[PDB]
Design a binder for this molecule. Structure first.
Ligand SMILES: [Cl-]
Ligand SMILES: [Cl-]
Ligand SMILES: [Zn+2]
Ligand SMILES: [Zn+2]
Lengths: 362, 362
């Protein structure tokens, strides 16, 4: 099937001799415009306490909200160099996001940021979040503020399964009350092989999130709470599209849970970081980094069934913290005009950075 | 919707009664496609000697590389001075960095330090089809004779000018070179401009994918004939959900000098930019970059016409690749891509040839 208009739009030279690629091009939706297509500007440094600082990791910025005349952002913060996993795991810092707490900063212009103080810290020895609390996002509901984040219980071994903690407050400045129990855990059905600390050696891989549940982000949606997350699997494979990473959602009736994973998981087949937002009654999601559908912006009318809306150039701003103060409903990608991100200055220390993006115009 | 037990497990799908839109897309992926076309490029590396960046000089769009007389040889577009663009006197200004070019060549023993030799093919006499610029060249060696094919513009270089492709040949890789008296390829003639203003977007009819331009000509001896792969630009080109509309075609001749006849199956890509193509396993492989819904893929056609996606790879930093035709291309699909030449934008006026690497992911 095809019209004359479609043939002309596609530049197809002979409808009696359609190449494989032209056949794929004729399956693209004809009513899908260019308004999901965007390009990022160069990453820009931040001023004040969010400038690079030797000896300190500040990374993985949350979404930004505005309260009290000020932008707020939450982020992972640790100090000291990273050794990695070849030595004493009880003693060393295995990743830059090991040994973290969650701190926060505010800004009147989104450029000069004042680090205010800790928001959420590691629990006492033996608790589920004693090793590191890190990789945070922010949700507001009915005048309360919620931070969901990754937790690790010591030791931070290659094979450890992280969980997700939740903390709440009555002001964006805290103080915050942590949940006594994690709100989300990886699947329980993988099975390791042997005793070596090797995340690739398994007897059974288990579900797509049998190892890790990452980048938790909660969107109040349809009167319920949709926690989108990234699974890593035990025995993760590399495919024609790279690392095999997929996204899930878990849904709660109330902010504090219980969050029950959707039978439709995984709700992506690709991606890495979680970057999602409600738009026109549904949920938009930027899929990046890994997988056959990396570098796409996707949209689900029901937060579950995502369709490709654009295929964009490789995205330079990783782990985006979305500008939630934007006029999100104006345009599918209005929320992405600016926001926060980070950059690997070096293997030990990273810093938060600001990005911009624009639609392309002829 | 079909599936097998083994697909469901490979894809990490949690429940076959509740398949997400994304999970259903993943079920269409070919189940016998391994991960051996998946690669990552390293960072661009500068060249030494005369192919170091040189303020005031453009050297760009490196041809594929061959080895003769003990040295690697490369041909490229070379011009001098700033670019004015299209807002001035077209007859006298330099409208693009690749305007006012001749084709030059360099040699090197290690592929790192390059000595610029001299002009290989220069603009023709005032009024000839190639008087304005000769640029964007490829090399092909056939039965002891060397062939360059390149783009040509006849002055004036207006927005709406249609470039063509010229061909030259020599008995030695140092030349002297003899040019074809006529061009060997031209853009489609079925587009219709709208208005008299120089505006490549204003059309009554767009015509074929290659109605405005026929770019990056590259000839591959194949099945005893000569397959000239090229990138079309289209009169009235749109920005779509995948960005600029850019597609590739092929034109086939019985003999190196032509006549080249366009395949009825054009276009044989639905995305891409500069041509980067190589023989492999009795078929043809193609690196699709920069633009379109299938950008950042490597594809392969068993017949040089019907290409299928073999990998989806991280955003490709090396455009306009000049492939290593000395590589043992049949050894594995991406063997040829271990190293080669490309270019980079130093600024809007000057570009430089660079060296790239890639590696299969572990
Ligand atoms: Cl983790
Ligand atoms: Cl041109
Ligand atoms: Zn994040
Ligand atoms: Zn080229």
């Amino acid at each position: 099937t095809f019209t004359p208009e479609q043939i002309d739009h596609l530049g197809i030279t002979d409808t009696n001799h359609l190449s494989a690629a032209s056949k794929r091009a004729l399956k693209w939706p004809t009513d899908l415009g260019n308004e999901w297509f965007i390009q990022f500007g160069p990453l820009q440094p931040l001023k004040g306490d969010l400038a690079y600082e030797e000896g300190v990791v500040r990374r993985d910025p949350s979404a930004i909200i505005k309260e009290n005349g000020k932008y707020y952002v939450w982020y992972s913060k640790s100090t000291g160099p990273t050794q990695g996993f070849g030595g004493d795991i009880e003693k060393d810092k295995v990743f830059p996001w090991d040994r973290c707490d969650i701190w926060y900063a505010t800004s009147e212009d989104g450029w000069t940021w004042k680090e205010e103080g800790p928001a959420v810290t590691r629990g006492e020895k033996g608790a589920y979040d004693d090793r590191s609390v890190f990789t945070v996002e922010i949700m507001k509901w009915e005048d309360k503020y919620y931070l969901c984040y990754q937790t690790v219980k010591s030791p931070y071994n290659v094979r450890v399964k992280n969980q997700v903690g939740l903390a709440w407050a009555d002001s964006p400045d805290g103080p915050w009350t942590k949940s006594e129990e994690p709100i989300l855990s990886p699947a329980d059905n993988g099975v390791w092989k042997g005793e070596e600390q090797d995340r690739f050696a398994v007897i059974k891989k288990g579900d797509f999130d049998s190892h890790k549940v990452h980048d938790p982000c909660i969107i109040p949606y349809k009167g319920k709470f949709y926690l989108y997350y990234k699974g890593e699997q035990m025995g993760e494979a590399i495919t024609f599209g790279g690392r095999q990473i997929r996204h899930g959602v878990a849904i709660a009736d109330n902010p504090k849970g219980p969050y029950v994973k959707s039978p439709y998981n995984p709700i992506s087949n690709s991606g890495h970081e979680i970057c999602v937002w409600p738009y026109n009654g549904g949920i938009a999601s930027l899929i990046t980094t890994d997988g056959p559908e990396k570098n796409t912006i996707q949209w689900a009318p029901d937060g579950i069934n995502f369709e490709i809306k654009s295929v964009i150039p490789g995205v330079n701003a990783h782990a985006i913290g979305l500008n939630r103060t934007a006029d999100v409903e104006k345009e599918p990608t209005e929320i992405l005009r600016w926001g926060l991100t980070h950059i690997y200055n070096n293997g030990d220390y990273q810093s938060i950075m600001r990005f911009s993006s624009e639609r392309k115009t002829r």
